[PDB]
Amino acid sequence: KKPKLLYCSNGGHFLRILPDGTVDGTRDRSDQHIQLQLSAESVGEVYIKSTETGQYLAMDTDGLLYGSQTPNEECLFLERLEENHYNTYISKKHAEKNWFVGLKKNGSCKRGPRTHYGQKAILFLPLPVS
Ligand SMILES: O=C(O)c1cc(O)ccc1O
């Protein structure tokens, strides 16, 4: 396996899953909580896992991102390759809704409802770390 940073184009923050379940974004490339394991359950279905805490990215019924201690339906994301090398991630559990993983410009998480295709918020460049 290979860990990766996920660099949000909106604002320029790496996706971060804090130990408390809080998901936001930091510009600190040293941050321990931005190293992420991607693993494909099925072809276009990934889990995004913290290599420090072993927590999985998830999205709840309101569209808030959290860190789940154990994988579940809420942690499956559909990964699509975009136009200039960036990926988008839409909640499997909420795909009929087009709820995307996204971060605000201030590096806070954008709830799934506030998301739409064409936003820079939802664009993540995977970078192989080191
Ligand atoms: O680049 C922007 O102005 C932008 C900011 C957002 O928070 C969401 C979508 C966008 O297109």
Curated annotation (Swiss-Prot):
Recall the taxonomic lineage recorded for the source organism: Eukaryota, Metazoa, Chordata, Craniata, Vertebrata
Specify the effect of K105E.
Reduced integrin-binding. Defective in integrin-, heparin- and FGFR1-binding, and defective in inducing FGF1 signaling, cell proliferation and cell migration
What is the organism field in this record?
Answer: Homo sapiens
The molecule here is called Fibroblast growth factor 1
Query: One GO CC term of this entry?
Result: extracellular region
Region Heparin-binding, annotated ranges: 104-120
Included range, full protein: 24 to 153 of 155
Q: What is the effect of changing N87A?
A: No effect on integrin-binding. No effect on integrin- and heparin-binding, loss of FGFR1-binding, defective in inducing FGF1 signaling, cell proliferation and cell migration
Which keywords does this Swiss-Prot/TrEMBL entry list?
Acetylation, Angiogenesis, Cytoplasm, Developmental protein, Differentiation, Growth factor, Heparin-binding, Mitogen, Nucleus, Phosphoprotein, Secreted
- Subunit arrangement? Monomer. Homodimer. Interacts with FGFR1, FGFR2, FGFR3 and FGFR4. Affinity between fibroblast growth factors (FGFs) and their receptors is increased by heparan sulfate glycosaminoglycans that function as coreceptors. Found in a complex with FGFBP1, FGF1 and FGF2. Interacts with FGFBP1. Part of a Cu(2+)-dependent multiprotein aggregate containing FGF1, S100A13 and SYT1. Interacts with SYT1. Interacts with S100A13. Interacts with LRRC59. Interacts with CSNKA, CSNKB and FIBP. While binding with LRRC59, CSNKA and FIBP seem mutually exclusive, CSNKB and FIBP may cooperatively interact with FGF1.
